[PDB]
Structure 1
């Protein structure tokens, strides 16, 4: 069940707008930057960032898509089920986008998929929520909210494009 709401629609809006500004700042413009969303919600978040960056800079940013699913037996392995990145990645700054960073293993799989699409100049990572508990030496460059969790809690990201509401909450039990 739902334990607590940790980001409402306004907190998500402000966090996404701030991240768009951070991306442009960090890269000193969006020249050579592309966004790649991870799974359904990462893809909606990537689209939202691209629209915001376009409104700020007046140049559009390509958005690509990775579908990653978990295979089991526990321990699990995230594998790429589908790829739609209809633009070059070689010599670009590829910004991966996901809803939640947890152990880091999904991002490792995504980073590895981009690295074998081509030869990016760099790979960055934007997430709406970092819930801690990394199991790999991976970190986000851009983070909406740091949300401390126990190992038994779940973060649930709801976005209006699929869930009818923008909300992030902690679930348990």
Structure 2
């Protein structure tokens, strides 16, 4: 191989179920919670989390979306990417609510920073928490996940690839060199 599998299909499901239980334990229930996915894959994970939480607790948790594209300022291969928020769609008011941002992979933190800015443009949440499927390290901003599916040690020359059915017809997270 040129890649290694760091979360297989069963492990992604197990991670999400653990995250769902952790959100319930931390918030003592889900009363005023709202899940907001970052980018297409984060939006799909948020919907999966909302489905699990509904199975556990029998209350529906609303799910919204923040659409973001990351750009480099140059022609090089820097992880230092600058986010642009392209759109939002959250179906409920977030003021005085507990918003849980959902990110597929936490790396630099720069996408999560943009997500937080976008939320504050829309309302005044009492809290913003962060759930991530993979934390690969190498923060460039002082950002930490509240809920982590799997910690995956990485170097900056490695890339994480996330496949989910809804987007690839398969669920898998892999790591490659280069």
Q: State how far apart, in whole Å, the 2-side matches of 1:134 and 1:101 are.
A: 8
Tell me the residue number matched to 1:60: 60
Q: For 2:148 and 2:23, how far apart are their aligned partners in 1?
A: 11
DSSP-derived class of the 1:86 partner: coil
- Pairwise mapping of residues 110-121 of structure 1 onto structure 2 (< 5 A)? 110-121=115-126
Alignment of 1:66-105 (within 5 A): 66-74=66-74, 75-105=80-110
Alignment partner of 2:96: what SS?
A: coil
Are the equivalent residues in 1 in contact too, given 2:68–2:85 (CA < 8 A)? Answer: yes
Displacement of 1:72 in angstroms is 3.4
Give the alignment's Cα RMSD to 1 decimal: 1.1
Rounded Cα–Cα distance in structure 2 between residues aligned with 1:20 and 1:73: 37
87-96 or 162-171: which moved more? Answer: 162-171
The TM-score, its normalising length taken from structure 2, stands at 0.94
2:103–2:131 contact (8 Å) kept in structure 1: yes
Cα distance, 1:70 vs structure 2? 1.8
Q: Please list the CA deviations of residues 61-109 of structure 1 after superposition, one character each: whole Å capped at 9, or x if unmatched.
A: 0000010012332443101101101210000000000100000000000
Unaligned runs of 5+ residues in structure 2 are 75-79
Query: Contact conserved, 2:68 with 2:86, CA < 8 A, in 1?
Result: yes
Please give the alpha-carbon distance, in whole angstroms, between the structure 2 residues aligned to 1:29 and 1:159. 28
- Unaligned segments of structure 1, at least 5 residues: none
Q: Residue 20 of structure 1 corresponds to which residue in structure 2?
A: 20
Instruction: Give the structure 1 partner of residue 167 of structure 2.
Output: 162
Please report how far the alpha carbon of residue 155 of structure 1 lies from its aligned counterpart in structure 2 after TM superposition. Answer: 0.6
Is the 1:2–1:169 contact (alpha carbons within 8 Å) kept by the matching residues of 2? Answer: no
Separation in structure 2 between the aligned mates of residue 112 and residue 82 of structure 1, nearest angstrom = 12
Task: Give matches, 1:25-64, under 5 Å.
Answer: 25-64=25-64
